């Protein structure tokens, strides 16, 4: 409801935020489960599903 009130009657209703939410899907929804970066590896395995 906070989101609804903040973006009450945007371009149509939001018409922008939903677009970046699709872009916000990055670093997520990918076959990769653990982000490697050199000797530091972070595994988003438990949180993935």
């Amino acid at each position: 409801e906070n989101i609804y009130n903040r973006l009450g009657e945007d371009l149509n209703k939001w018409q922008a935020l939903l677009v970046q939410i699709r872009k916000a899907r990055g670093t997520f929804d990918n076959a990769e489960t653990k982000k490697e970066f050199g000797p530091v590896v972070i595994d988003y395995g438990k949180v993935q599903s």
């Binding site: 899907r25 929804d29 990918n30 076959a31």
Partner: peptide
């Protein structure tokens, strides 16, 4: 011989099924 092998060294072809944006 290759045909009956299909049914001669043969490479193993692989492909996967995945889902993205719930597709």
């Amino acid at each position: 011989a290759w045909t009956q092998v299909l049914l001669p060294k043969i490479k193993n072809v692989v492909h996967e099924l995945r889902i993205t944006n719930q597709v």
